[PDB]
Ligand binder design. Sequence first.
Ligand SMILES: Nc1nc2c(ncn2[C@@H]2O[C@H](COP(=O)(O)OP(=O)(O)O)[C@@H](O)[C@H]2O)c(=O)[nH]1
Lengths: 25, 426
Amino acid sequence: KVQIINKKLDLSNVQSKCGSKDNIK
Amino acid sequence: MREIVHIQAGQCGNQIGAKFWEVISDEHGIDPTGSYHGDSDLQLERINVYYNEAAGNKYVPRAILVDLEPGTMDSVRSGPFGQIFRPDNFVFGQSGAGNNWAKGHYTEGAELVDSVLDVVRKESESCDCLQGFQLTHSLGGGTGSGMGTLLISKIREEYPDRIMNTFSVVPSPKVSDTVVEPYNATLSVHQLVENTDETYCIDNEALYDICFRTLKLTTPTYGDLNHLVSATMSGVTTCLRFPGQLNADLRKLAVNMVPFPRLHFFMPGFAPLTSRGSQQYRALTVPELTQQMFDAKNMMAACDPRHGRYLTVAAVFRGRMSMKEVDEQMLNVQNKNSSYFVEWIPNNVKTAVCDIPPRGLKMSATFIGNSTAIQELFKRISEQFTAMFRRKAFLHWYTGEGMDEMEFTEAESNMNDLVSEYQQYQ
Ligand SMILES: Nc1nc2c(ncn2[C@@H]2O[C@H](COP(=O)(O)OP(=O)(O)O)[C@@H](O)[C@H]2O)c(=O)[nH]1
């Protein structure tokens, strides 16, 4: 009467941190 | 009469100035101990121009050595002529620059420049007639660039009527020695264009090309390139030390060579240059020197002068020569190649003749040209700087010390305005 501990894992939406485009304008 | 205070900053500057002082000590017959053991009265006639006389037949080179890392100065002290400098003038820190102009200009330079300036003032108070300051430094090295800009600003503020001459090593068009060379070069020019009187642009790439093609050297070192640069430096001020048929000091050079106050960057040259074997095959004449000087392959700045026009040309000759010979050669040069000089300046060439040739030569000549083609170098620097700055490449290293984006933006604007001015006058 057991069930495996499986979780739905996702890194859904991760943005970059280095502002490599901040001076693109 | 006139005197010169030699300032020597950065690793590049320290090495170049060590070779320069070796050459100067050789020209005046001064052994590594400082005791004069020459053979001519002219060696002592104007020995005061670079040396203070410490009683005991010994002379001390009026040089000031600046760095943020003690290794280069240790090598200088331990090497040949290391004892020739009075140890009072070795002013060095401990942190180092790390090729960060912001660091060397705002933090480590801000800490060390007070001692540097105290040494400068002490050396200047001993002068009878101070004429100009010489700074030997590279534009890429953090120590060189930052200390140079800061110290030049300070000295210009202290002595506004003295001549500020600098011999700067400029970035190469093909191979970079430092990843952040563009930021340092741009921020250095942004102050050199404002505070200096004249700057000689020497590129290591052109030095390699010359020493390989002309001198036929297969294993050139920094010592050989520094020997060439030092020969040029000595030819620049040979007129301040020895008599001649037509002498020109630093003030006449600065007046004749700078038509407008902001267009004060020059491409130096030298002649004669020969391999050892070819010396027995070519006669040494004034036409030969004139042909070697006005040649694109003999320009120590990585820029073909045939892509622009000259504003003015300085040609200082050394050794016994006929005045009519040099005059005829200069007239022929101006007449045959009139298309490479601006139409609004007649009589583009100012000359001078020193009667003492370099040791081992019958005659020589030093070239100093103000060519509008250096807009190529400045435009390349501006383009690479823009390419790096558009993506904040390595920007945080400079911002952390205290610089903001406004300073980089103003530096870029000033660089582009200088390029636009050169384009206007071409
Ligand atoms: N002409 C010449 N250039 C040098 C010499 N040593 C280093 N350089 C140049 O200086 C740059 C290195 O910067 P450097 O002055 O050593 O770094 P710093 O210690 O932060 O000032 C490189 O682009 C080299 O080409 C030298 O002896 N002669």
